Design an enzyme around this catalytic site. Sequence first.
Site, PDB file in Angstrom:
ATOM      1  N   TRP A  97       0.869  -1.197   0.000  1.00  0.00           N
ATOM      2  CA  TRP A  97       0.000   0.000   0.000  1.00  0.00           C
ATOM      3  C   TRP A  97       0.909   1.252   0.000  1.00  0.00           C
ATOM      4  O   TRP A  97       1.720   1.380   0.933  1.00  0.00           O
ATOM      5  CB  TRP A  97      -0.875   0.002   1.236  1.00  0.00           C
ATOM      6  CG  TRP A  97      -1.904  -1.108   1.302  1.00  0.00           C
ATOM      7  CD1 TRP A  97      -2.272  -1.993   0.312  1.00  0.00           C
ATOM      8  CD2 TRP A  97      -2.825  -1.325   2.390  1.00  0.00           C
ATOM      9  NE1 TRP A  97      -3.356  -2.735   0.722  1.00  0.00           N
ATOM     10  CE2 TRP A  97      -3.699  -2.375   1.999  1.00  0.00           C
ATOM     11  CE3 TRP A  97      -2.980  -0.750   3.652  1.00  0.00           C
ATOM     12  CZ2 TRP A  97      -4.726  -2.821   2.809  1.00  0.00           C
ATOM     13  CZ3 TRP A  97      -4.004  -1.229   4.470  1.00  0.00           C
ATOM     14  CH2 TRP A  97      -4.874  -2.244   4.039  1.00  0.00           C
TER      15      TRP A  97
ATOM     16  N   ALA B 210       1.358   7.324  -4.352  1.00  0.00           N
ATOM     17  CA  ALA B 210       2.101   7.840  -5.490  1.00  0.00           C
ATOM     18  C   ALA B 210       1.138   8.624  -6.333  1.00  0.00           C
ATOM     19  O   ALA B 210      -0.025   8.196  -6.470  1.00  0.00           O
ATOM     20  CB  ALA B 210       2.801   6.771  -6.336  1.00  0.00           C
TER      21      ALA B 210
ATOM     22  N   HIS C  52       8.269   1.084  -3.563  1.00  0.00           N
ATOM     23  CA  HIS C  52       7.753  -0.313  -3.616  1.00  0.00           C
ATOM     24  C   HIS C  52       6.823  -0.510  -4.768  1.00  0.00           C
ATOM     25  O   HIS C  52       6.797  -1.634  -5.316  1.00  0.00           O
ATOM     26  CB  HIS C  52       7.131  -0.667  -2.275  1.00  0.00           C
ATOM     27  CG  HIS C  52       8.151  -0.851  -1.220  1.00  0.00           C
ATOM     28  ND1 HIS C  52       7.847  -0.857   0.128  1.00  0.00           N
ATOM     29  CD2 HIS C  52       9.502  -1.087  -1.298  1.00  0.00           C
ATOM     30  CE1 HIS C  52       8.960  -1.038   0.831  1.00  0.00           C
ATOM     31  NE2 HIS C  52       9.979  -1.179  -0.066  1.00  0.00           N
TER      32      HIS C  52
ATOM     33  N   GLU D  55       1.778  -3.669   4.217  1.00  0.00           N
ATOM     34  CA  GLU D  55       1.311  -2.568   5.097  1.00  0.00           C
ATOM     35  C   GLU D  55       0.089  -2.974   5.875  1.00  0.00           C
ATOM     36  O   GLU D  55      -0.071  -2.546   7.020  1.00  0.00           O
ATOM     37  CB  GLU D  55       1.030  -1.305   4.280  1.00  0.00           C
ATOM     38  CG  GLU D  55       2.254  -0.459   3.901  1.00  0.00           C
ATOM     39  CD  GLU D  55       3.091  -0.975   2.783  1.00  0.00           C
ATOM     40  OE1 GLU D  55       2.735  -2.002   2.142  1.00  0.00           O
ATOM     41  OE2 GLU D  55       4.139  -0.328   2.496  1.00  0.00           O
TER      42      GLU D  55
ATOM     43  N   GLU E 192       4.874  20.261  -6.819  1.00  0.00           N
ATOM     44  CA  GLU E 192       5.437  19.167  -6.039  1.00  0.00           C
ATOM     45  C   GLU E 192       5.814  19.629  -4.625  1.00  0.00           C
ATOM     46  O   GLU E 192       5.835  20.827  -4.273  1.00  0.00           O
ATOM     47  CB  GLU E 192       6.647  18.587  -6.785  1.00  0.00           C
ATOM     48  CG  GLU E 192       6.396  17.691  -7.984  1.00  0.00           C
ATOM     49  CD  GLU E 192       7.643  17.321  -8.776  1.00  0.00           C
ATOM     50  OE1 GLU E 192       8.798  17.792  -8.416  1.00  0.00           O
ATOM     51  OE2 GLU E 192       7.530  16.521  -9.815  1.00  0.00           O
TER      52      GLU E 192
ATOM     53  N   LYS F 273      16.704   2.685   1.107  1.00  0.00           N
ATOM     54  CA  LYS F 273      15.501   3.361   0.585  1.00  0.00           C
ATOM     55  C   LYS F 273      14.989   4.426   1.568  1.00  0.00           C
ATOM     56  O   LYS F 273      14.460   5.454   1.061  1.00  0.00           O
ATOM     57  CB  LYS F 273      14.420   2.340   0.288  1.00  0.00           C
ATOM     58  CG  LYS F 273      13.049   2.900  -0.038  1.00  0.00           C
ATOM     59  CD  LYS F 273      12.164   1.812  -0.594  1.00  0.00           C
ATOM     60  CE  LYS F 273      10.726   2.268  -0.761  1.00  0.00           C
ATOM     61  NZ  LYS F 273      10.187   2.682   0.569  1.00  0.00           N
TER      62      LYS F 273
HETATM   63  C1  LIG Z   1       2.060  11.780   1.712  1.00  0.00           C
HETATM   64  C2  LIG Z   1       2.387  11.790   0.223  1.00  0.00           C
HETATM   65  C3  LIG Z   1       3.421  10.937  -0.160  1.00  0.00           C
HETATM   66  C4  LIG Z   1       3.838  10.913  -1.523  1.00  0.00           C
HETATM   67  C5  LIG Z   1       3.212  11.730  -2.415  1.00  0.00           C
HETATM   68  C6  LIG Z   1       2.141  12.607  -2.048  1.00  0.00           C
HETATM   69  C7  LIG Z   1       1.741  12.569  -0.685  1.00  0.00           C
HETATM   70  C8  LIG Z   1       0.552  13.395  -0.215  1.00  0.00           C
HETATM   71  C9  LIG Z   1       1.548  13.394  -3.210  1.00  0.00           C
HETATM   72  C10 LIG Z   1       0.731  14.644  -2.892  1.00  0.00           C
HETATM   73  C11 LIG Z   1       0.628  12.461  -4.030  1.00  0.00           C
HETATM   74  C12 LIG Z   1       2.730  13.897  -4.052  1.00  0.00           C
HETATM   75  C13 LIG Z   1       3.444  12.695  -4.656  1.00  0.00           C
HETATM   76  O1  LIG Z   1       4.728  13.387  -5.116  1.00  0.00           O
HETATM   77  N1  LIG Z   1       3.689  11.704  -3.777  1.00  0.00           N
HETATM   78  C14 LIG Z   1       4.484  10.583  -4.231  1.00  0.00           C
HETATM   79  C15 LIG Z   1       5.074   9.819  -3.241  1.00  0.00           C
HETATM   80  N2  LIG Z   1       5.904   8.782  -3.541  1.00  0.00           N
HETATM   81  C16 LIG Z   1       6.112   8.496  -4.828  1.00  0.00           C
HETATM   82  O2  LIG Z   1       6.785   7.483  -5.183  1.00  0.00           O
HETATM   83  N3  LIG Z   1       5.486   9.163  -5.821  1.00  0.00           N
HETATM   84  C17 LIG Z   1       4.632  10.285  -5.548  1.00  0.00           C
HETATM   85  O3  LIG Z   1       4.063  10.758  -6.529  1.00  0.00           O
HETATM   86  N4  LIG Z   1       4.892  10.039  -1.908  1.00  0.00           N
HETATM   87  C18 LIG Z   1       5.715   9.383  -0.949  1.00  0.00           C
HETATM   88  C19 LIG Z   1       5.451   7.930  -0.699  1.00  0.00           C
HETATM   89  O4  LIG Z   1       4.091   7.764  -0.266  1.00  0.00           O
HETATM   90  C20 LIG Z   1       6.388   7.360   0.401  1.00  0.00           C
HETATM   91  O5  LIG Z   1       7.706   7.450  -0.120  1.00  0.00           O
HETATM   92  C21 LIG Z   1       6.080   5.927   0.797  1.00  0.00           C
HETATM   93  O6  LIG Z   1       7.117   5.456   1.646  1.00  0.00           O
HETATM   94  C22 LIG Z   1       5.932   5.009  -0.417  1.00  0.00           C
HETATM   95  O7  LIG Z   1       5.514   3.701   0.043  1.00  0.00           O
HETATM   96  P1  LIG Z   1       6.463   2.415  -0.109  1.00  0.00           P
HETATM   97  O8  LIG Z   1       7.020   2.442  -1.503  1.00  0.00           O
HETATM   98  O9  LIG Z   1       7.522   2.556   0.936  1.00  0.00           O
HETATM   99  O10 LIG Z   1       5.519   1.260   0.184  1.00  0.00           O
HETATM  100  O1  LIG Z   2       4.842  14.786  -6.614  1.00  0.00           O
HETATM  101  C1  LIG Z   2       5.435  14.916  -5.414  1.00  0.00           C
HETATM  102  O2  LIG Z   2       5.276  16.133  -4.894  1.00  0.00           O
HETATM  103  C2  LIG Z   2       6.206  13.840  -4.623  1.00  0.00           C
HETATM  104  C3  LIG Z   2       6.256  13.863  -3.227  1.00  0.00           C
HETATM  105  C4  LIG Z   2       7.005  13.011  -2.497  1.00  0.00           C
HETATM  106  C5  LIG Z   2       7.643  12.025  -3.031  1.00  0.00           C
HETATM  107  C6  LIG Z   2       8.426  11.127  -2.274  1.00  0.00           C
HETATM  108  C7  LIG Z   2       9.082  10.141  -2.920  1.00  0.00           C
HETATM  109  C8  LIG Z   2       8.978  10.019  -4.245  1.00  0.00           C
HETATM  110  C9  LIG Z   2       8.250  10.843  -4.983  1.00  0.00           C
HETATM  111  C10 LIG Z   2       7.580  11.889  -4.455  1.00  0.00           C
HETATM  112  C11 LIG Z   2       6.842  12.804  -5.241  1.00  0.00           C
HETATM  113  K   LIG Z   3       4.207   2.440   2.435  1.00  0.00           K
HETATM  114 MN   LIG Z   4       5.853  -0.609   1.242  1.00  0.00          MN
END
Ligand SMILES: Cc1cc2c3c(c1C)C(C)(C)C[C@@H](O)N3c1c(nc(O)[nH]c1=O)N2C[C@H](O)[C@H](O)[C@H](O)COP(=O)(O)O
Ligand SMILES: O=C(O)c1ccc2ccccc2c1
Ligand SMILES: [K+]
Ligand SMILES: [Mn+2]
Lengths: 500, 500
Positions: free
Chosen positions: A166, A169, A188, A230, A279, A388
């Site tokens: 979960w 992105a 992930h 998750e 972003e 990571k």
């Molecule tokens: C809280 C939050 C986290 C993320 C994002 C947003 C929010 C609100 C957006 C507003 C949608 C902006 C977007 O840039 N965004 C985003 C993102 N990670 C990405 O790969 N790609 C993204 O587009 N993360 C961060 C990821 O959620 C974390 O890095 C998490 O650790 C990933 O999970 P996992 O791979 O570890 O399972």
């Molecule tokens: O689109 C973004 O603002 C955003 C935010 C946090 C993010 C964190 C990890 C990877 C991609 C990400 C992209």
């Molecule tokens: K996660």
């Molecule tokens: Mn994960």
Amino acid sequence: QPAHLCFRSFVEALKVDNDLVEINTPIDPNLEAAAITRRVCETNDKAPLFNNLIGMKNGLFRILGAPGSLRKSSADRYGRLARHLALPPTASMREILDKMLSASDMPPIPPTIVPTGPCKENSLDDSEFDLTELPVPLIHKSDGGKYIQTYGMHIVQSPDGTWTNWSIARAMVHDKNHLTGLVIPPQHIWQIHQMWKKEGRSDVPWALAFGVPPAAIMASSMPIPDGVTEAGYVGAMTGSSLELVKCDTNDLYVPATSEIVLEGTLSISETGPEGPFGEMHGYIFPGDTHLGAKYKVNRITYRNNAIMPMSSCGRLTDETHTMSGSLAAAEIRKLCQQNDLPITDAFAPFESQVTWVALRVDTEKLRAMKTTSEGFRKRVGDVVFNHKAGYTIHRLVLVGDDIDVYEGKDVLWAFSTRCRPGMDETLFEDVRGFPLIPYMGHGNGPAHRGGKVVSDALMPTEYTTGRNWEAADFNQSYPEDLKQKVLDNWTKMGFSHHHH
Amino acid sequence: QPAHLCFRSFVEALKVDNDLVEINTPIDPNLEAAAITRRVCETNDKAPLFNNLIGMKNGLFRILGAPGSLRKSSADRYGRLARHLALPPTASMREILDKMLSASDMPPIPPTIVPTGPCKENSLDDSEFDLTELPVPLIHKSDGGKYIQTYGMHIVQSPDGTWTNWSIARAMVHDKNHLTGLVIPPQHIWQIHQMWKKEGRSDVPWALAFGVPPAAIMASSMPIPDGVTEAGYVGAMTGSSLELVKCDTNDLYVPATSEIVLEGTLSISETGPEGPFGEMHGYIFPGDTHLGAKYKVNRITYRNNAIMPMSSCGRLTDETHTMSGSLAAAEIRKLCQQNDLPITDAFAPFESQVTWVALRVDTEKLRAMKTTSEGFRKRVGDVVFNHKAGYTIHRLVLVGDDIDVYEGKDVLWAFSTRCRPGMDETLFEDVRGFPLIPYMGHGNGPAHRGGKVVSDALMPTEYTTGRNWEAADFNQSYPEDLKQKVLDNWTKMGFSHHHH
Ligand SMILES: Cc1cc2c3c(c1C)C(C)(C)C[C@@H](O)N3c1c(nc(O)[nH]c1=O)N2C[C@H](O)[C@H](O)[C@H](O)COP(=O)(O)O
Ligand SMILES: O=C(O)c1ccc2ccccc2c1
Ligand SMILES: [K+]
Ligand SMILES: [Mn+2]
Ligand SMILES: Cc1cc2c3c(c1C)C(C)(C)C[C@@H](O)N3c1c(nc(O)[nH]c1=O)N2C[C@H](O)[C@H](O)[C@H](O)COP(=O)(O)O
Ligand SMILES: O=C(O)c1ccc2ccccc2c1
Ligand SMILES: [K+]
Ligand SMILES: [K+]
Ligand SMILES: [K+]
Ligand SMILES: [Mn+2]
């Protein structure tokens, strides 16, 4: 159903907290909803609930903006985050991050399958929906698309079935039945995508659930370890097995009370235009469209009177800072501890645009190590920047025990006064870099490599015999009995509430 | 006599502004006065006037704390500084620094000698005073002495008579008739001291005037150029020749309305213990006593009901930050401009503990230069870090035109997001360093050399074709007509004064 386990209950909790503004007059998803939300985030105002969204049809959809942003008061600053987790609204950051880490040495509590739930109250097949006809927001004026996905959770599973991830992105509408989005290493969703691409047989079964249990969206935002599902981490954290229903068109399972569910596939072959997007670092680069991953939507299911959460991200302070930054810092704290490094606390200062993490050092333990700044900086940077959890972080700041890393002012003071530029730093050029930071992807060097640093704000005696200063402040440069006298006579003399 | 030309009038101005608390009950100069003052400075409260100081005898002395510190409101934040200069109390930093720079291309207005003034109302000879019997404050609990001198001006003149320097440098009581203090390179008191030492014939004629004209104490705190007599610079800035009276025991001249004047000599041979002191970067290192310069006091003259100004310096925010930091930044702005560098503004962010200066670049002019980051950083650093005005500053941050350098939040955003660590920086190891910064004098490297950096937070297109982003903020990512609508309907919808 409790607030931390049910998004609809969470909305009610914010209302009851006097932390919600219900807008019942028509609001345009073209920029207006997101502008209001942006203003909220920049001013720490109440979360906006848009109950009357121009283009809402047959229940799709209302919007909740700023679901994880800050409150104005110091005393309940993090109360929206606390409400994701069953914590009192006065909870500290430390308490929030401890709650998010608590499941890391607990047995998972796997989810429970139930036959139905509110997310099945309405459905639209392959012939009944068009994503371009929904009230999907334009969040920033230069965005390359309407970003439907800013606060839902993508659900994908490894080919062998053993790991269900979960995560948040971003994704935007490509056409009537597809999205495009970011799927990048080392995330992930990308790791699982690669497993399906190597197998080469089919596109990735996928679902995207919006308005999930708040405790689930928090774990969705956290870099818990590779291979860890998750749902079972959230189960352990909350003490409760999450109730999941099967998708109608695939064998993935979504939270039973999800507001809105998209079911379909993540292509192992196809791409489409994605971005630009305003972003987390505070920028958009107009026209910077790139190829992204492409999702096909086969089915929508949704609650009656469904609510779509939305993050209007950018400059301080929103979910990208409060959740993605802080949760990455939490994971880094644990990672350091697991590598036998004497780290007590970690936080990504908002002032740094969550590109730094400050690491509070137990300097008693550091002194017993009988090491040096050069050695210790290298050790910390190798641990964090090769993992990571360190992906998004470009500067680590080491501070001693006197610094509260959750207080940006104090981090900036220590950094500015205790770390000699160059000499007290180690640069890391051969590590993965975070391309979204402007100085990376739009900078002078490789977008994907290097640009990282460990900045040692430990003073020399903190490695040897102990701190050899006192602060020139009210707290440390006057005795207790005088300080108390000054405070007791403060208003009497003519100088000038905690809640507020 | 106007507030900016007469300290006693300045005190009345603060009272009238409702920016003063008169404490008329007994206050102990042993820590209590300074503790109150420290609390004021940490909270931006009203300036304290201690009218009843335990140990005051025959008019020596009352204390005014926090004379140049900040006010609580945003609208008149810098009002105490404005009152030093005849500016409205709502003046911006830019306006204050422009006023301080204005005399740099004006003819000096030399001082006027008058036969007497209030500073001659009382006198104590060589047989009538004992500095250990005056109510000299202990400012921080670990200080190495009672720091009589935190906001007076030292007056010394070159042997040839052509340059009379006014400057603030700390000094503490050594014994009944001597002070010790900091006299360090490249400061003008040190430069003049060296001239007398090379001549080798006599100790330096000296005076120390407390409670001088506020416009004079501002220039005393500023690194105006070598060889420039502050009195004539202040005369040009204010449009008024300053009235000076001769000392009784030497041929130096002091402001006629000085509250308290010490007359004597600065030794060209003798030293004595000096420090430690709770210093501008926020620290004291207990027991770190070093040899300092030694002053002999031959005479005291003072006003009836004399008032001693005091800076209880340390952590944010006090005169060391508001005046020494900001005035150094002002001089750096001019220095850059005079070296044909396209700098519009400079400020030392408080967040940096005034160890950084942010330099706002006119990027139109930068683009016409057809240069690169590496080249431009080197050019800026060579100008600034090779000059006295750059002495106290260890990090220069280059920012483009969108950044308000007087707003620390915006400087931190640009630094954190636009300057790639290492690649976008140039380290300077072969420049004079500021030893008072803890990471210098108490750090891992040479106390007096290096530790400086130029951090380029200009983005690549700012050197070539122009800014290629918009901010992801309310201001830049929504059209004007929508922004205005949101603001006009803000309270109606249910969301939440400039003076406050
Ligand atoms: C809280 C939050 C986290 C993320 C994002 C947003 C929010 C609100 C957006 C507003 C949608 C902006 C977007 O840039 N965004 C985003 C993102 N990670 C990405 O790969 N790609 C993204 O587009 N993360 C961060 C990821 O959620 C974390 O890095 C998490 O650790 C990933 O999970 P996992 O791979 O570890 O399972
Ligand atoms: O689109 C973004 O603002 C955003 C935010 C946090 C993010 C964190 C990890 C990877 C991609 C990400 C992209
Ligand atoms: K996660
Ligand atoms: Mn994960
Ligand atoms: C505003 C202010 C300035 C200074 C100081 C203080 C205040 C309040 C103390 C509280 C007394 C702390 C002391 O550390 N202090 C101080 C000092 N300069 C020194 O050489 N030595 C000092 O002990 N400056 C800075 C100098 O005033 C400026 O650098 C100025 O430019 C010098 O004048 P000049 O040499 O350029 O003529
Ligand atoms: O004692 C200090 O806090 C202090 C402050 C500012 C200073 C500036 C230049 C040189 C010496 C200085 C000493
Ligand atoms: K250090
Ligand atoms: K000066
Ligand atoms: K740069
Ligand atoms: Mn000078």
